[PDB]
Amino acid sequence: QNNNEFKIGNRSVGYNHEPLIICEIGINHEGSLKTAFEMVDAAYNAGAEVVKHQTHIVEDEMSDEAKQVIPGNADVSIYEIMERCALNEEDEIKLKEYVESKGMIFISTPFSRAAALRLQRMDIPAYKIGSGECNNYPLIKLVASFGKPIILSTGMNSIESIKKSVEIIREAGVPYALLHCTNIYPTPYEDVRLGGMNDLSEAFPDAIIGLSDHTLDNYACLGAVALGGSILERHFTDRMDRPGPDIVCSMNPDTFKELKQGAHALKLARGGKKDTIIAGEKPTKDFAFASVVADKDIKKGELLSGDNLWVKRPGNGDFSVNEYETLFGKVAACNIRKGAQIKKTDIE
Amino acid sequence: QNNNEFKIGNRSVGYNHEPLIICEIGINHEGSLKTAFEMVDAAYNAGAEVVKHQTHIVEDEMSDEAKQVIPGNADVSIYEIMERCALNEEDEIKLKEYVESKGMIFISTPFSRAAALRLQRMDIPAYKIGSGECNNYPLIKLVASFGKPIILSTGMNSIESIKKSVEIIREAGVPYALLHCTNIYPTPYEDVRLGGMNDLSEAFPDAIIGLSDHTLDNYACLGAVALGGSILERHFTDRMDRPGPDIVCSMNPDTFKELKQGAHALKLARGGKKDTIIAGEKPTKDFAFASVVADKDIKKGELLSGDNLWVKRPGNGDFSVNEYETLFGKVAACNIRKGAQIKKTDIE
Numbered sequence: 148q149n150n151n152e153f154k155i156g157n158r159s160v161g162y163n164h165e166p167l168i169i170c171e172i173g174i175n176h177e178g179s180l181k182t183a184f185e186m187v188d189a190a191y192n193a194g195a196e197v198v199k200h201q202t203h204i205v206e207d208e209m210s211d212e213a214k215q216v217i218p219g220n221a222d223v224s225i226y227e228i229m230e231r232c233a234l235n236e237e238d239e240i241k242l243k244e245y246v247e248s249k250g251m252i253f254i255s256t257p258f259s260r261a262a263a264l265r266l267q268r269m270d271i272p273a274y275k276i277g278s279g280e281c282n283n284y285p286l287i288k289l290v291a292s293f294g295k296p297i298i299l300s301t302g303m304n305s306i307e308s309i310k311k312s313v314e315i316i317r318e319a320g321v322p323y324a325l326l327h328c329t330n331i332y333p334t335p336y337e338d339v340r341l342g343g344m345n346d347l348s349e350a351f352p353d354a355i356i357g358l359s360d361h362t363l364d365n366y367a368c369l370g371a372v373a374l375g376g377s378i379l380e381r382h383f384t385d386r387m388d389r390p391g392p393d394i395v396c397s398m399n400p401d402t403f404k405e406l407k408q409g410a411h412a413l414k415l416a417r418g419g420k421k422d423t424i425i426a427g428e429k430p431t432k433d434f435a436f437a438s439v440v441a442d443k444d445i446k447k448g449e450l451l452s453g454d455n456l457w458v459k460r461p462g463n464g465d466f467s468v469n470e471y472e473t474l475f476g477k478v479a480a481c482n483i484r485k486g487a488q489i490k491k492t493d494i495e
Numbered sequence: 496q497n498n499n500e501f502k503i504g505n506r507s508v509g510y511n512h513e514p515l516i517i518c519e520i521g522i523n524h525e526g527s528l529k530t531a532f533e534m535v536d537a538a539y540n541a542g543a544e545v546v547k548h549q550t551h552i553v554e555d556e557m558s559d560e561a562k563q564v565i566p567g568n569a570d571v572s573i574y575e576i577m578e579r580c581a582l583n584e585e586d587e588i589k590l591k592e593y594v595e596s597k598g599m600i601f602i603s604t605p606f607s608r609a610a611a612l613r614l615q616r617m618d619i620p621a622y623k624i625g626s627g628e629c630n631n632y633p634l635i636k637l638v639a640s641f642g643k644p645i646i647l648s649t650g651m652n653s654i655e656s657i658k659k660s661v662e663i664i665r666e667a668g669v670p671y672a673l674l675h676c677t678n679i680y681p682t683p684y685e686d687v688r689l690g691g692m693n694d695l696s697e698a699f700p701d702a703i704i705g706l707s708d709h710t711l712d713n714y715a716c717l718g719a720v721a722l723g724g725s726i727l728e729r730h731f732t733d734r735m736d737r738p739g740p741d742i743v744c745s746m747n748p749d750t751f752k753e754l755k756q757g758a759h760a761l762k763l764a765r766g767g768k769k770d771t772i773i774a775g776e777k778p779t780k781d782f783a784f785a786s787v788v789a790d791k792d793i794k795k796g797e798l799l800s801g802d803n804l805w806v807k808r809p810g811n812g813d814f815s816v817n818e819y820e821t822l823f824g825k826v827a828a829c830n831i832r833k834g835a836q837i838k839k840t841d842i843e
């Protein structure tokens with residue numbers, strides 16, 4: 148589809164590269180470092196390349212009004228939830244160090260100016276901007292000036308709305324990705340709309356395309372890889388028993404491995420062209436294709452026709468079924484036995 | 496993508512319909528009715544809708560030359576293999592009756608004129624033409640005149656080659672499907688080229704598009720459903736222990752069920768548009784979107800600016816982050832407390 152690409156550290160991302168799966172524990176650790184470390188351990192052992200976090204600083208990402216609003220996947224204010232799961236600066240710094248001590252790449256999502264500045268201090272290789280901030284241009288402008296590539300989720304936003312952010316990013320001069328997404332926890336299959344990825348790619352030809360997902364399984368993501376997605380994001384947990392509003396739609400070690408295996412197979416199987424000639428098929432063609440044979444005994448001098456000629460496998464005869472009709476009207480240069488392939492020496 | 500459709504009995508096929516999985520036991524029964532019945536039983540219990548067979552009549556589908564050619568997935572002549580697995584007419588008639596006694600649809604693939612005529616006598620609802628016969632125009636012409644819809648595999652053939660057959664089909668006036676395919680048993684992921692489906696759909700806009708597959712698993716087919724495939728074909732067996740050249744790439748009860756479940760999820764998740772508004776996302780938008788707040792204490796009379804104004808969740812403030820800049824230069828109609836959302840009554 149395209150050859151757009153950029154790097155997240157030493158990891159190349161793009162259509163012509165192995166798709167990247169981002170394991171986001173997000174707020175899954177419920178504010179506990181011990182839990183966060185156990186989830187990072189699971190991610191490592193499962194074979195994860197990237198672990199994404201969520202950088203929350205309650206007072207800077209939301210005003211008092213947030214103490215009165217409830218998210219769709221919970222029964223208490225988003226403020227209460229965030230004040231409960233948020234890791235302070237020192238703890239998040241240890242989390243990043245720990246992820247990296249496991250040989251994995253650490254990136255996070257800022258939801259405020261203060262968070263962006265903290266992550267800049269930490270010098271992460273790339274910045275993820277959540278669908279909720281996709282239309283938060285002043286914040287996008289700040290992040291873009293950091294000079295690192297941006298992975299922008301586009302849920303809850305139209306192409307035109309997204310256009311403004313992409314313009315700010317290009318202005319900044321940093322490479323970027325666009326992840327189609329639907330922000331319902333969990334998300335039903337009917338709301339996914341994989342076609343949205345093509346809408347994004349056609350609208351922004353220089354963008355790396357992927358999918359951020361919240362369904363209950365891997366189907367959406369596998370479908371995204373088949374469509375050309377280069378980046379895949381699903382929340383992640385060490386085990387599905389855990390409490391938390393995003394746990395239900397999270398993938399675990401076993402499911403991650405399945406997504407990774409399926410992503411590899413689909414990276415290989417996708418795209419290509421119908422007319423491409425595949426050498427491996429030759430022995431099949433040589434026996435399956437039909438050649439022109441005699442449908443009846445034909446005496447020398449008699450005319451060949453669609454009545455005394457037919458076609459049968461294999462494809463080694465002097466005349467291929469594609470040439471069947473060109474033989475009509477020709478003259479038998481000798482007696483032709485029924486069932487025999489028609490050879491060049493059989494006609495005048 | 497399109498609304499093309501047609502029926503195989505009472506089963507509607509097309510992009511806007513549940514994708515159809517064709518379980519082809521083909522030659523998997525190794526010529527044994529008992530084995531064929533056991534495989535049909537497995538297909539039934541697994542939840543299969545269609546069972547496809549292969550109608551072989553050795554003397555009519557191939558000349559003596561075939562006794563000297565070996566297929567890629569075997570070590571004996573294709574003639575020997577077919578003479579070994581071929582079911583005579585009476586037995587195949589019992590097979591069709593048995594499939595139907597299980598409430599499933601029976602269709603088959605003819606490889607000769609005699610086979611086509613036998614299946615016409617049996618009055619099957621639709622005809623499958625294998626990739627090997629995709630370029631066998633005289634045979635396609637015969638089948639098309641039967642007045643039933645055609646499912647045409649297109650492996651080993653270019654778009655131009657396929658063009659001739661599609662023309663013959665349209666001429667005949669029957670609806671048809673085009674299954675992208677690669678004929679190597681088994682087929683590696685890299686040879687699949689799912690993009691071939693789009694090449695087929697763009698070249699033949701009135702065709703129902705699907706995929707016939709020979710890889711070792713469901714990934715290719717699941718990818719095809721994500722791309723818009725309406726028909727999926729994989730060889731089928733009751734168990735992977737069975738002997739036979741096509742067994743290795745066949746799906747079994749458990750894998751069929753997986754393909755069927757994944758096909759359903761992907762039918763729901765595919766297509767759609769990026770700009771489509773999803774009601775379920777509203778509660779997320781209401782809390783995640785940012786509103787303009789005061790970044791500092793602003794005294795009445797003072798001018799609002801990008802220095803004393805900022806943005807924070809939630810999205811219920813009088814001014815959305817999208818309107819952030821329009822507030823620049825405005826005059827505070829009263830003292831504005833730091834951290835408070837900017838309201839319409841705060842400016843002159």
Ligand SMILES: CC(O)N[C@H](CO)[C@@H](O)[C@H](O)[C@H](O)CO
Nearest residue numbers: 173218221277279332392393783
């Ligand atoms: C919109 C947003 O910030 N979503 C994030 C990332 O997907 C979620 O983790 C929410 O913070 C969470 O669902 C709130 O309960």
Ligand SMILES: CC(O)N[C@H](CO)[C@@H](O)[C@H](O)[C@H](O)CO
Nearest residue numbers: 435521566569625627680740741
């Ligand atoms: C080309 C062809 O006829 N292929 C059929 C259907 O895919 C196969 O079943 C072969 O008859 C088989 O692989 C021969 O060994």
Ligand SMILES: [Mn+2]
Nearest residue numbers: 359360361382
């Ligand atoms: Mn998410």
Ligand SMILES: [Mn+2]
Nearest residue numbers: 707708709730
């Ligand atoms: Mn096949």
